[PDB]
């Protein structure tokens, strides 16, 4: 009766091959939300997954002390880390979490997709923050690209809160993974096209470095 | 306070129970380990290889 066993084995093998062919089409992402930084608005038992699509290239995103289960996401395409721009020094907690996630010692092929969020509150507070003494000893970048209707203080704050998560990102990475600020606010609708482009960019960079050009 | 005193007392009972436990000397424990090893030192294919006659892994 071994013939039946072999036939069943071959049928399971072909089914597994088809399932793998389906599987090797989509990408994976991780969301290390700070806890309350609009984790529900940027969506545009414990494990919760979402499945959106861009240009027919179906993606795969899912959300989650955390010192251990990072091991299960060694192959994610990128990390969609979501910060809150309202500082209370919880921004220091977010910076510490980012620092810990950077020199993980195991995640050395993962790039972070930053999503500085809730800019309206920052604008209201600054117009109407100053805890860090380093803010005074700062200047706006010479290549600023402010959208119309911006105050110099607002731009200074916006480009100083983004200069803390990159001053450490591009410090020890041996040119294997990078950071990509994409300032957003509760007000936007095309963040889904700031993820697709960044994923394409990361994969292209990885291939280019594999070919040993740059 | 209730949680703190509860955990403290629980630690108290755990410590007192595990304190009054017989501690067999290492010598005869090692003797028993040696006896088991020798009594089962022959049925060790991982240490005594066998021919293909009774080795389905071929």
């Amino acid at each position: 009766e071994d013939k039946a066993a072999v036939e069943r084995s071959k049928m399971i093998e072909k089914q597994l091959q088809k399932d793998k062919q389906v599987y090797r089409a989509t990408h994976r992402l991780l969301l290390l939300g700070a806890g309350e930084s609009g984790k529900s608005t940027i969506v545009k038992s414990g494990i919760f997954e979402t499945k959106f699509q861009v240009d027919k290239v179906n993606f795969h995103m899912f959300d989650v002390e955390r010192r251990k289960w990072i091991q299960c996401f060694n192959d994610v395409t990128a990390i969609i880390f979501v910060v809150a721009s309202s500082s209370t020094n919880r921004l220091q907690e977010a910076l510490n979490l980012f620092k810990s996630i950077w020199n993980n010692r195991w995640l050395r092929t993962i790039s972070v997709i930053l999503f500085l969020n809730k800019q309206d509150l920052l604008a209201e507070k600054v117009l109407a923050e100053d805890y860090f003494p380093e803010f005074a000893r700062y200047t706006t970048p010479e290549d600023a690209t402010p959208e119309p209707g911006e105050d110099p203080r607002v731009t200074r704050a916006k480009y100083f809160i983004r200069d803390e998560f990159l001053r450490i990102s591009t410090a020890s990475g041996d040119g294997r993974h990078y950071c990509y600020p994409h300032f957003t606010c509760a007000v936007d609708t095309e963040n889904i096209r700031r993820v697709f482009n960044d994923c394409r960019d990361i994969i292209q960079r990885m291939h280019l470095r594999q070919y040993e050009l740059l | 306070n209730t949680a703190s005193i509860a955990q403290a007392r629980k630690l108290v009972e755990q410590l007192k129970m595990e304190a009054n436990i017989d501690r067999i000397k290492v010598s005869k424990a090692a003797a028993d380990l040696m006896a088991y090893c020798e009594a089962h030192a022959k049925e060790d294919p991982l240490l005594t290889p066998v021919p293909a006659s009774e080795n389905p892994f071929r």
């Binding site: 290549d143 994969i203 291939h207 280019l208 050009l213 | -």
Partner: protein, 264 residues
């Protein structure tokens, strides 16, 4: 009564042996594990196989002229050399082309589309190589005396002309492909440098090596007839064979993967 070999023939034979040995080593490394069944590695293996055929044919031809007295079988040897060279050029073009559809379809790579593309492209390359190797063993041969022999003793004029035209067209395609790859690399390098120029040196080196290794033979073959000084053919064909000692190292050793296996 057999001819006395000249020094240039010995140089060609030793270069062929070295190429054969290196390509044999590379193909042995590639075929050593079933885990290297990747499109790029498959194309690299095809390139290594073509270069191995070229080297083996060259050494067999040398051993079948000046050591084993015979000339009727050498025609098949020259045909094999032509097939191997055409296959090598086609495989190099294939590798260059696949290097651009992975830097532009980064979100659709790792799919049956790539497998189909590489299969079809390899099949076309080997079919063209077979055709170009069969042509010198067909009605268009200079042995019958009803045609004009060229700068190569058993060859003719038409075959060399068509080969040169095909090579020039392929050279143009490769030039365009790099140009595009250089554009993309420059864009990425500028984006990286935004948040404070090695992305072009490798392209220049590879293109210069390929040009300086292949162009002279065709260039001095087109404007030539079957009366040029004998040493011209050897001087123009030496770089063509030398190219097989620089192709495999660049395309299968600078990789960080095979290097570890080589170290063992």
């Amino acid at each position: 009564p057999l001819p006395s070999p000249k020094a240039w023939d010995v140089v060609l034979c030793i270069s062929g042996t070295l190429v054969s040995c290196e390509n044999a080593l590379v193909v042995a490394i590639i075929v050593g594990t079933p885990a290297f069944r990747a499109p790029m590695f498959l194309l690299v293996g095809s390139l290594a196989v073509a270069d191995l055929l070229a080297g083996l044919g060259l050494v067999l031809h040398f051993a079948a002229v000046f050591c084993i007295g015979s000339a009727e079988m050498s025609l098949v040897l020259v045909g094999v050399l032509a097939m191997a060279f055409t296959a090598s050029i086609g495989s190099l073009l294939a590798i260059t082309v696949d290097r651009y559809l992975s830097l532009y379809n980064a979100l659709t790579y790792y799919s049956e589309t790539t497998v189909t593309r590489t299969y079809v492209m390899l099949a076309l390359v080997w079919g063209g190589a077979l055709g170009l190797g069969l042509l010198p063993v067909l009605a268009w041969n200079c042995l019958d005396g009803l045609t004009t022999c060229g700068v190569v003793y058993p060859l003719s004029k038409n075959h060399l002309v068509v080969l040169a035209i095909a090579f020039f067209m392929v050279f143009g395609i490769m030039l365009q492909l790099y140009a595009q790859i250089c554009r993309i690399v420059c864009r990425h390098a500028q984006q990286i440098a935004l948040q404070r120029r090695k992305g072009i040196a490798t392209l220049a080196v590879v293109l210069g090596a390929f040009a300086a290794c292949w162009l002279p033979f065709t260039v001095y073959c087109l404007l030539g007839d079957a009366h040029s000084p004998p040493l011209y053919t050897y001087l123009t064909l030496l770089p063509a064979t030398y190219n097989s000692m620089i192709n495999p190292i660049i395309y299968a050793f600078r990789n960080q993967d095979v290097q570890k296996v080589l170290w063992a």
